[PDB]
Design a protein around this ligand. Structure first.
Ligand code: M0U
Length: 212
């Protein structure tokens, strides 16, 4: 064992349905949101590194990398943001998902734009437009490396990660649905980034696969 299982609060099934009923026609939006979250965590590490530059001992470069993988049908997004404790992980993907689902629904119900999804703390869930399963590996300076995983049903799991150590930051791996392998194409990824994340204040690098 050492795997812990968590039940989503009921708002999550509502979230998933809202997301389909708001972004199904524009699925590419998930990349904007993930990049955006990466940007946020980058902002936090930059910020605390000003008061204490030892915060950057775990890695100085502040960036975002995008790693398609046609062979695995995965798209992974890596950042060296501040990363998450176990409690941040559970808090952001669980507690705040559910309270932010409610706030977002109330905001749309009063005519706010859907493009607001990010600001209600549930942008990440848009990932399930394109992915049957998502894994979030994260590592923050005051804590171990954790893996979070969910197919967005009723539960999510947390375990201590024993995989390749990142030094600090967050990795989201998307296991793409059969019908969404367009998100593994170099051309497509470049477009989406160009369109949605042009003004992100941190280098976003696409890692190309070779022919072999
Ligand atoms: C305790 C401090 N740690 C972090 O905050 C952190 N560290 N890594 N990430 C992070 C999280 C995700 C998602 C899986 C939630 C991500 O895709 C990339 C990340 O760097 C985060 C992270 C956590 C939450 C968010 C969401 N912020 C939304 C918020 C809404 C209101 C306006 C300001 C921004 C974005 C990034």
């Amino acid at each position: 064992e050492e795997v812990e299982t968590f039940a989503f609060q009921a708002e999550i099934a509502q979230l998933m349905s809202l997301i389909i009923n708001t972004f199904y026609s524009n699925k590419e939006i998930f990349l904007r949101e993930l990049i955006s979250n990466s940007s946020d965590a980058l902002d936090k590490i930059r910020y605390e590194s000003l008061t204490d530059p030892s915060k950057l001992d775990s890695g100085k470069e502040l960036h975002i990398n995008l790693i398609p993988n046609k062979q695995d049908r995965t798209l992974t997004i890596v950042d060296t943001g501040i990363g998450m404790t176990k409690a941040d992980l559970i808090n952001n993907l669980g507690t705040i998902a559910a309270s932010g689902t409610k706030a977002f629904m109330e905001a749309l119900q009063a005519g706010a734009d859907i493009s607001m999804i990010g600001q209600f703390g549930v942008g990440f869930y848009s990932a399930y437009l394109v992915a049957e399963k998502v894994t979030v590996i994260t590592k923050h300076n005051d804590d171990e490396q954790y893996a979070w995983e969910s197919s967005a049903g009723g539960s999510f799991t947390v375990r201590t990660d024993t995989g390749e150590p990142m030094g600090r930051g967050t990795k989201v791996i998307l296991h793409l649905k059969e019908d969404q392998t367009e998100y593994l194409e170099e051309r497509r990824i470049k477009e989406i980034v160009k369109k949605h994340s042009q003004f992100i204040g941190y280098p976003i690098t696409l890692f190309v696969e070779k022919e072999r």
